[PDB]
From a paper:
In the present work, we present the purification and biochemical characterization of a mJRL from the stem of Ananas comosus (AcmJRL). Size-exclusion chromatography clearly showed that AcmJRL is a homodimeric lectin in solution. AcmJRL adopt the expected β-prism fold with the three characteristic Greek key four-stranded β-sheets (β1–2 + β11–12, β3–6 and β7–10) and all the connecting loops well defined in the electron density. The structure of AcmJRL is the second structure of a mJRL reported with two carbohydrate-binding sites per monomer after BanLec.
Residue numbers in the entry:
A (entry chain A), B (entry chain B), C (entry chain B), D (entry chain A): 2 to 145
Write the structure that this text describes.
């Protein structure tokens, strides 16, 4: 693997979903959100071929697409976790900050904050726990 | 060099302090704290030799020592940042969770939280910004 | 920076040439050769952008181009070192073996052999020593 | 794992033997040898605890022990593979070069040479194929 794997942020419900590969570049994120984060889908590169992970989560909210340009990469992720309805603890919001611009916040910023500023490294993939929504979230990082 | 470097959590004052080496094992932390985190000092192993980083920060508060046992390693770090006195934003508290027990809280766990749960990897060193207190804090992780 | 760097195979003359980047994928090699290896040039990907390293070496011999397909990567490299003309020790031949086919031999496979079979990892870049020919050769590998 | 794994050098007989761990430091090698390399055993450090790998191979030849000092690490390995008796291809000799001294050659230098000079990295463990002798040999390297 040889990735640093951070997580999980969020609760214990839903079902664990994870990659089966060796990503070296994150190229695309499709995120569904509204009052919380509904679903995650992302594309990564491995040995020059592009693979799609997800979609993980439900079909609620509205969709937003992040297509990273060549030379663009994530330098930080922020979010919040907390209650919604009957769910004790899930991912309420996510913000993706690249070296060129900020994407988000997606969802609504309620609950306990978290933040992952990256001084040296590359974010290449994600994992989490998912049901009809994103119960929990985690990150794969590669040394730079 | 092949480490993922996360940070900084906290403010922009004090002075940057950082390691000059290639750590593969964190063996000891000495932390001074009271209402905030006053100072950090830690030992790491490189090529079988033990090196001391720090002390970074002042001589206020009280001292606590964490000596990791063989087979003991950090699985998560928590903290809070915020104002103290005349300082706009510094590290108010830190908690270190190993696979055997929890160390802390050091400081006071009020203010804005951050958290770094490690699903796969090893925390091997730290860096930050320091004056008479710990202005900012960061972490080095190795893939596992 | 988080790469394993193997080398050098060959002699001590010519001039050191090396990359200035963080490669994650080798996409192309252009090699000039005849009785020895005359020059090396290769393309790699970093943050989704393609960068060209080299050409290192002279304009003798004949050119061959290796363009790796998506999903194609090197699993082994072979070569030989030895004398040519007035040069005490240089790279006489190189063979590049991918998971799909074998490229070469380039040069002449006489002299002292070396071999780098990769059980787990990825070859992402090269370096060496160069004058009018390839005096010496080395390899960058990434954990897989 | 997050190690670069090189190999195998040697033949296809014997039985594959390999580590079940995440070594970060090689501390000791015990090698049995005579006309070829008979067996390998080595100690490594993981999360500050010492683990013994092997012994792999038979009980022939004579034993030699390499105990690395703090601050001592391997910078290169050399060897030869080839026939002995009824064995078509096995490991005939090995030499271990540290930043302080050279250990070996062990065995007898017959057959096809190989060499692994390390410009950047650390050798932390080995694997191979083994019967009554060392049929084949491989190396684990960590980025530095
Ligand atoms: O964000 C959670 C939830 O928010 C809103 O109620 C709707 O858009 C749903 O489709 C969505 O699942
Ligand atoms: O995603 C929110 C919610 O989705 C579904 O209802 C179930 O899988 C729950 O376990 C989960 O908490
Ligand atoms: O921790 C910051 C600061 O907190 C309080 O003001 C006192 O207890 C000091 O000893 C300490 O330096
Ligand atoms: O550490 C708290 C404080 O210490 C010193 O007074 C200076 O370095 C300041 O810049 C810093 O904010
Ligand atoms: O390859 C080294 C050298 O080999 C021969 O001398 C010739 O074919 C040259 O074209 C070439 O430069
Ligand atoms: O490359 C072969 C030869 O090329 C040039 O003449 C010089 O750089 C030499 O040092 C080198 O040995
Ligand atoms: O080295 C292979 C072989 O060499 C010699 O014949 C003896 O020392 C044996 O014990 C050993 O197995
Ligand atoms: O190690 C040399 C030899 O040992 C044993 O005889 C068997 O396991 C063989 O397969 C192997 O080739």
């Amino acid at each position: 693997s040889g990735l640093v794997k951070l997580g999980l942020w969020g609760g214990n419900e839903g079902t664990l979903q994870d990659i089966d590969g060796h990503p070296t570049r994150l190229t695309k994120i499709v995120i569904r959100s509204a009052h919380a984060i509904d679903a995650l889908q992302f594309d990564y590169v491995e040995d020059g071929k592009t693979f799609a992970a997800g979609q993980w989560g439900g079909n609620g909210g509205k969709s937003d697409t992040i297509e990273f340009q060549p030379g663009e990469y994530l330098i930080a992720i922020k979010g919040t976790t907390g209650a919604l309805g009957a769910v004790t603890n899930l991912v309420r919001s996510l913000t993706f900050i690249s070296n060129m611009r900020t994407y988000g916040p997606f969802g609504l910023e309620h609950g306990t904050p978290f933040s992952v500023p990256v001084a040296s490294g590359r974010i290449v993939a994600f994992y989490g726990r998912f049901g009809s929504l994103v119960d929990a979230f985690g990150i794969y990082l590669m040394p730079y």
